[PDB]
Amino acid sequence: KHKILHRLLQD
Amino acid sequence: KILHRLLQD
Amino acid sequence: SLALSLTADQMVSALLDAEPPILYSEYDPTRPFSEASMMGLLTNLADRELVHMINWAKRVPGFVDLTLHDQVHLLECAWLEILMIGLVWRSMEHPGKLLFAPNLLLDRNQGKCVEGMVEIFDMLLATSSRFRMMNLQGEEFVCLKSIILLNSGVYTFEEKDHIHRVLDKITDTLIHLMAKAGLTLQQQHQRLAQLLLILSHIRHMSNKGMEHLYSMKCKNVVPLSDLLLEMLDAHR
Amino acid sequence: SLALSLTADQMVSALLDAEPPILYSEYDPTRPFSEASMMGLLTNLADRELVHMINWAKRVPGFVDLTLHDQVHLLECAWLEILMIGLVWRSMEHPGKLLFAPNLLLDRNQGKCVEGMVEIFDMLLATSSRFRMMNLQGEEFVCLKSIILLNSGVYTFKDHIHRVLDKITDTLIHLMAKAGLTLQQQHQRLAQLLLILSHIRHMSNKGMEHLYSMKCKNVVPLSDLLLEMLDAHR
Lengths: 11, 9, 236, 234
Ligand SMILES: CC/C(=C(/CC)c1ccc(O)cc1)c1ccc(O)cc1
Ligand SMILES: CC/C(=C(/CC)c1ccc(O)cc1)c1ccc(O)cc1
Known about the structure:
The complex is a heterotetramer, with 2 copies of chain A and 2 copies of chain C.
Chain A: H1 4-10
Chain C: H1 8-17, H2 35-57, H3 68-91, E1 98-101, E2 104-106, H4 117-134, H5 138-151, H6 159-180, H7 185-219, H8 226-233
Antiparallel strand pairs in C: 1-2
The complex binds diethylstilbestrol (2 copies).
Subcellular location (chain A): Nucleus
Organism (chain A): Homo sapiens
Protein name (chain A): Nuclear receptor coactivator 2
């Protein structure tokens, strides 16, 4: 699923 | 309070 | 204080001698499961355990030196953590199952009989798996359980200074045990930390369980005992 | 993993260097606060802190070696514990007060502005006082905060995380032996510190429920990020 947390962790 | 009583005796 | 005079071995012996018994459930394996019946079983069991727990706490070194008000608070704080760590200890040699009583051994699928209970079962099972992993000893278990009694409500209250002194004595005890088990100084500190970190997850389970228990009370599917209701209301 | 090869001193520096910055709140000096305004300030702050927290987490030795899902799990489990222990740490030198931000230092009674918040404030204030009396050091603090990150979600999943957890314990002990504490004082303090983590868990769980209620009460719009971190606990 889309997760703002995913983005922050990957960035 | 039950706990209070049970603690007492 | 008598608690401050006990040696490590004397501490272990006192804690072991104070162990509550393992109660049976009113469980009848002939009448299968409903949400109301299992909840009944679990809460009935907890109610009976609670009476033993209260009399056990009095035998925990240092606990009798506290004011009555402080005793009530600690037990009100810790009662479900203590029920849970006992449960996890019992279940340690039953992989995938929670031994609530010798005649009531449940895996997670039965936890689905009650709404949201399976989340709690899973956490308890993971904790039992952890104890199994660590090869947790009974001597260590009784130390941890008394730490929970004294520690969980100590931040929500001289009186505390006494408690922290007893807590320290139990730390001394855990370390003495590990040194006897042939553990190096490093291994002692590592195991010590490992044991105390588990108490964080035990708090977490109690917190969730308390919320689940409160919701069931409002759901009104099975009569909770007077003592359990009072304990439950002590968290609100 | 690279974390296990690190020495104790190297671990302390790595953690110290990963520390997030102390962010500010809004400079609107209108007092007192309303419920909505205090709620707005707190949630706005936590929102911005969360972004830095993720940066911090990725710099916690061993955390990068975890899969993305594991990282996500640990952070979703521990995020409020981590905000709170940081809050409590910052508030240590301000007895009776919570230093949410340098320009947002709140006393006990200001917690009354939000219903059910004063109970959370009292628990945080007691935790800060406990840290104060223990003379908690920054090196110990960062070790504890890392422990929370790695430990709180590890039983809701192992060896790698637990090895790193062991590494921090070693690091903690190393710090205490450094301060001249005796062996008995060393494990006694170790125990005292780790037991406070149980109370931090309790506070987080209390705070999580309060946040959830405020979501349902719809007093203040919560960010998608904060909502998602919150959704992970229900
Ligand atoms: C997890 C079930 C449980 C309880 C304690 C009453 C429970 C029951 C129903 C709920 O909705 C929540 C918790 C319990 C009972 C006895 C033990 O020795 C340990 C745990
Ligand atoms: C306790 C307030 C709080 C939060 C985090 C969002 C909160 C806000 C409103 C609630 O109803 C409950 C908790 C928080 C915010 C920033 C921190 O660094 C630490 C804690």
